[PDB]
């Protein structure tokens with residue numbers, strides 16, 4: 001699953017913040033993903 | 049030991065207070081001169097103050 005940010009959500013980096021993603025298929029329980037994000041530490045960072 | 053017991057002493061927080069509410073709002077008269085104090089320091093990272 002990959003999320004690409006547009007110019008709205010891209011505007012400044014997530015820091016000291018909780019990000020929640022939820023995937024809700026048409027049958028069965030949704031998957032809810034939550035991370036508190038510290039300052040990102042590389043070009044890619046492991047947040048959760 | 050001395051029988052002092054206070055169940056709640058917590059009254060105030062500066063976490064509620066923006067820098068603009070305290071900076072330049074207390075001042076010292078050194079003779080003729082009057083100096084505005086800066087009390088809340090601040091810095092920026094990732095667009096947060």
Ligand SMILES: *[C@@H]1O[C@H](CO)[C@@H](O[C@@H]2O[C@H](CO[C@H]3O[C@H](CO)[C@@H](O)[C@H](O)[C@@H]3O)[C@@H](O)[C@H](O)[C@H]2NC(C)=O)[C@H](O)[C@H]1NC(C)=O
Pocket residue numbers: 072073074075084
């Ligand atoms: C330093 O502290 C002073 C006292 O808190 C403060 O004076 C107050 O100013 C506000 C509005 O600010 C304007 O007018 C002041 C002069 O009074 C100017 O210094 C400032 O540049 C603005 O033009 C006013 O409502 C209030 O009555 C003032 N209080 C007193 C006791 O005089 C100063 O503004 C503040 N900063 C500087 C740079 O001196």
Ligand SMILES: *[C@@H]1O[C@H](CO)[C@@H](O[C@@H]2O[C@H](CO[C@H]3O[C@H](CO)[C@@H](O)[C@H](O)[C@@H]3O)[C@@H](O)[C@H](O)[C@H]2NC(C)=O)[C@H](O)[C@H]1NC(C)=O
Pocket residue numbers: 073074075076
């Ligand atoms: C702590 O808060 C007090 C209010 O609870 C305040 O007392 C008031 O003081 C004002 C005048 O304040 C100016 O002048 C003093 C010296 O006279 C400066 O130290 C100060 O920075 C200000 O520029 C007065 O009009 C009023 O009657 C006082 N109120 C009471 C209840 O006494 C103190 O000034 C304040 N402490 C500091 C260090 O600012």
